[PDB]
Swiss-Prot record, chain A:
Function of the molecule: DNA-dependent RNA polymerase (RNAP) catalyzes the transcription of DNA into RNA using the four ribonucleoside triphosphates as substrates.
Name used for this protein in its record: DNA-directed RNA polymerase subunit beta'
Domain of life (superkingdom): Bacteria
Modification after translation (UniProt): Acetylated on several lysine residues in the presence of glucose.
Species: Escherichia coli (strain K12)
Biotechnological applications listed in the UniProt record: Co-administration of salinamide and rifampicin or salinamide and myxopyronin suppresses the emergence of resistance to both antibiotics.
From Swiss-Prot, chain C:
Quaternary context: The RNAP catalytic core consists of 2 alpha, 1 beta, 1 beta' and 1 omega subunit. When a sigma factor is associated with the core the holoenzyme is formed, which can initiate transcription. The rRNA transcription and antitermination complex (rrnTAC) consists of RNAP, NusA, NusB, NusE (rpsJ), NusG, SubB, ribosomal protein S4, DNA and precursor rRNA; S4 is more flexible than other subunits. In pull-down experiments interacts with CedA.
Function per UniProt: DNA-dependent RNA polymerase (RNAP) catalyzes the transcription of DNA into RNA using the four ribonucleoside triphosphates as substrates. Resistance to the antibiotics salinamide A, salinamide B, rifampicin, streptolydigin, CBR703, myxopyronin, and lipiarmycin can result from mutations in this protein.
Gene symbol of the encoding locus: rpoB
Parent-protein residues present: 846 to 945 of 1342
Protein name, as recorded: DNA-directed RNA polymerase subunit beta
Transmembrane segments: none
Family membership noted in the UniProt record: Belongs to the RNA polymerase beta chain family.
Industrial and biotechnological uses noted in the record: Co-administration of salinamide and rifampicin or salinamide and myxopyronin suppresses the emergence of resistance to both antibiotics.
Modification after translation: Acetylated on several lysine residues in the presence of glucose.
Length: 50, 50, 100, 50, 415
DNA sequence: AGACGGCTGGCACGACTTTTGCAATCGCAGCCCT
DNA sequence: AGGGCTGATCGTGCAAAAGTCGTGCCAGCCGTCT
């Protein structure tokens, strides 16, 4: 089988989209919050304590 | 190749026991794939080749 | 190259061709049993070079040069019989009309 | 699985895959020139979607 | 008065339309290949198995028999190597010596290779791996029983008299082989039905490959010609980026995006105009075709680049690039544009034009002369005199080679 | 049996076609420095 | 407030060389033939 470069990341749109929101489980990302974010639609803070 | 075992080397099966299922990271995606994809054309109609 | 209905399938037996007429249109009214070719067409292929093997072949037999391959139509398997009538559609632009 | 004698039509057997490769190439052409934000974000969103 | 040339009547060229003409003269298959390879960076420029049945392909059908045939590992390797370099016609592609080299075994010799080939020479079909076919027809006849008459005469001819039949030299063949008069032809005919290229027989199937680019359907006389809509390329202007440019804080960067977009719009409109000019040219050509194609290539007037470019305002280079590698499907079928033009002649049809299907049907009639011998160029000249159009024997040889007809004293055959 | 011939093609020369391969100036005015 | 001023514009068809063909037509040839 082949591959592809895939610089644009690809999480399993499988991942965390079923009843087990796996990513919402790991990053604690709220499903609405994570949902708004992945559409590149939030620009949420990532870190930053200062 | 001696052409007797090279022909013979085609056919063999293992125990394959205890089939497991676990996730995967892209480095092995490069590893398993003999290559990565680059173009969206499949074949020609001008010469009908890969 | 255009495939042509001439019943001139290369490497073919006459009896198979025997039911076929000049068109390849087999004479109307015969029995069918087995799978012999009904429409005798051939697919033209690309030409041969000097091709010393093929040169000697066309020198020996000739007239074929493997230029076409037997590209013919036959009776359906296990399905046999005799005809009652036939049909054909020649698009405008060709005027063969062999047994037609 | 060719249909008409002419065209192969692996629809979504590659039409998805081919569209993917095509957009991937388009991206590899575009963002390397410091892509405009609107275009680049819309394209990447389409990429995740596809 | 005192004639001559006198001063009267510059800037910078660019390859813009020149590259465009490079595309047009290039064929639309690779032209679309570039069109994709072009539109890529221009961001504003827009089951799995079905039947899934495998086949034999003959050589593997031979392998199927080989598997059931008793064979050793070296024997299997030699047979498989022999199978590897196999032609469609069923003749052996490489010689026995090349096969011995490919085996790469000093134990493997030419005799062992020949024995392996012969044990596999007539398994399926007769005359497989012909190896410079000649002994292949010999093995085919040998497969036939000797009860068939004239088998001896055919065999002696095929032994070492292929050349005599090569030139259709029946008199020299009879003088050499001492073959019977009006009976040696019987051995010749029995040889004629010998399944040549018998391996070519297995190969029979192909899919369709010709692209209708324009369509004239003879719509009520003077065909309604029309191009292929889907085949005609077209881009979509980035209206998002068109609205992503002015409002860009760098109104300079975004308005420059707008300017590049406008320039590309000019490029696409020029390509479409190229298509449309080709189309009106096609309208003139179809006006021609309503008689020519309707009367076929036989009644076709030879046209010239000058002639067509005169009917248009298109430059002669413009048209000359425009049609290069162009083909349209018509009521006749898919026909190439490069085929459209033809050289004119000095025939006494009252005019100058091209031979074409006249030359083809002339070859047809020259063959249609007594099947004893091909009609000579004088026959063509007389046929043209009947046609009332002047044609010459040198011209006849020319038009015949154009129709690729056999020579007069080469196509003579026993009736 | 040897010249007959009809052919065919090389030969060459015109007859027609034919592609490719060019490369700013007139202004502008904006900029920038001074 | 004046200078410099500089690169900011924006095009394309046809020619020149090349090729290339029509057309036939001489040399060798084959048929055979008287």
């Amino acid at each position: 089988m082949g591959h592809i470069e895939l610089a644009s990341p690809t999480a399993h749109i499988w991942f965390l989209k079923s009843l087990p929101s796996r990513i919402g489980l790991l990053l604690d990302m709220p499903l609405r919050d994570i949902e708004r974010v992945l559409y590149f639609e939030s620009y949420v803070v990532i870190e930053g304590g200062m | 190749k001696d052409l007797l075992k090279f022909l013979k080397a085609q056919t063999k099966t293992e125990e394959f026991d205890a089939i497991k299922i676990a996730l995967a990271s892209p480095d092995m995606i490069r590893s398993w794939s003999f290559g990565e994809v680059k173009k969206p054309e499949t074949i020609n109609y001008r010469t009908f080749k890969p | 190259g255009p495939e042509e209905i001439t019943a001139d399938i290369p490497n073919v037996g006459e009896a198979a061709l025997s039911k076929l007429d000049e068109s390849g249109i087999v004479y109307i009214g015969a029995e069918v049993t087995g799978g012999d070719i009904l429409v005798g067409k051939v697919t033209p292929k690309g030409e041969t070079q000097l091709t010393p093997e093929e040169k000697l072949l066309r020198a020996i037999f000739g007239e074929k040069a493997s230029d076409v391959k037997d590209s013919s139509l036959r009776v359906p398997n296990g399905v046999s019989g005799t005809v009652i009538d036939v049909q054909v559609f020649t698009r405008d632009g060709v005027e063969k009309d062999k047994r037609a | 699985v060719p249909l008409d004698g002419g065209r192969f039509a692996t629809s979504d057997l590659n039409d998805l895959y081919r569209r993917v490769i095509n957009r991937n190439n388009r991206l590899k052409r575009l963002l390397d020139l410091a892509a405009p934000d609107i275009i680049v974000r819309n394209e990447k969103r389409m990429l995740q979607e596809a | 008065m005192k004639q001559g040339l006198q001063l009267r009547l510059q800037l910078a060229m660019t390859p813009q339309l020149q590259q465009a003409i490079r595309l047009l003269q290039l064929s639309t298959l690779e032209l679309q290949q570039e069109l994709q390879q072009a539109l890529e960076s221009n961001p504003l420029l827009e089951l799995p198995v079905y039947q899934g049945e495998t086949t034999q392909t003959l050589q593997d059908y031979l392998m199927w028999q080989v598997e059931l045939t008793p064979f050793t590992d070296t024997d299997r390797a030699i047979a498989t190597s022999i199978v590897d370099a196999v032609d469609d016609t069923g003749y052996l592609t490489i010689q026995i010596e090349d096969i011995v080299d490919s085996i790469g075994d000093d134990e493997i010799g030419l005799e062992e290779v020949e024995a392996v080939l012969k044990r596999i020479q007539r398994f399926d079909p007769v005359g497989v791996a012909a190896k410079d076919l000649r002994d292949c027809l010999l093995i085919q006849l040998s497969q036939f029983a000797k009860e068939t008459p004239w088998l001896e005469e055919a065999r002696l001819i095929i032994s070492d008299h292929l050349d005599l039949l090569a030139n259709h030299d029946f008199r020299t063949l009879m003088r050499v082989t001492r073959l019977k008069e009006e009976v040696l032809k019987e051995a010749v005919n029995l040889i004629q039905s010998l399944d040549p290229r018998p391996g070519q027989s297995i190969q029979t199937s192909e899919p369709e490959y010709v692209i209708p680019d324009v369509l004239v359907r003879k719509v009520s006389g003077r065909w309604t010609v029309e191009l292929n809509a889907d085949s005609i390329p077209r881009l979509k202007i980035n209206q998002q980026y068109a609205a992503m440019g002015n409002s860009a804080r760098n109104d300079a960067d975004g308005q420059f995006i707008r300017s590049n977009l406008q320039e590309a719009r000019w490029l696409i409109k020029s390509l479409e105009s190229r298509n449309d000019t080709l189309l009106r040219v096609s309208r003139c050509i179809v006006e021609q075709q309503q008689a020519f194609f309707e009367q076929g290539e036989e009644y076709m007037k030879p046209m010239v680049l000058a002639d067509i470019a005169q009917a248009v305002e298109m430059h002669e280079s413009t048209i000359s690039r425009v049609t290069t590698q162009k083909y349209l499907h018509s009521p006749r079928g898919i026909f190439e544009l490069k085929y459209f033009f033809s050289s004119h002649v000095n025939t006494e049809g009252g005019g100058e034009a091209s031979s074409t299907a006249i030359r083809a049907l002339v070859k047809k009639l020259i063959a249609a002369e007594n099947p004893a011998k091909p009609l000579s160029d004088s026959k063509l000249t007389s046929m043209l005199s009947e046609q009332g159009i002047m044609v010459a024997r040198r011209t006849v040889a020319k038009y015949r080679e154009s129709l690729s007809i056999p020579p007069s004293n080469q196509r003579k055959q026993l009736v």
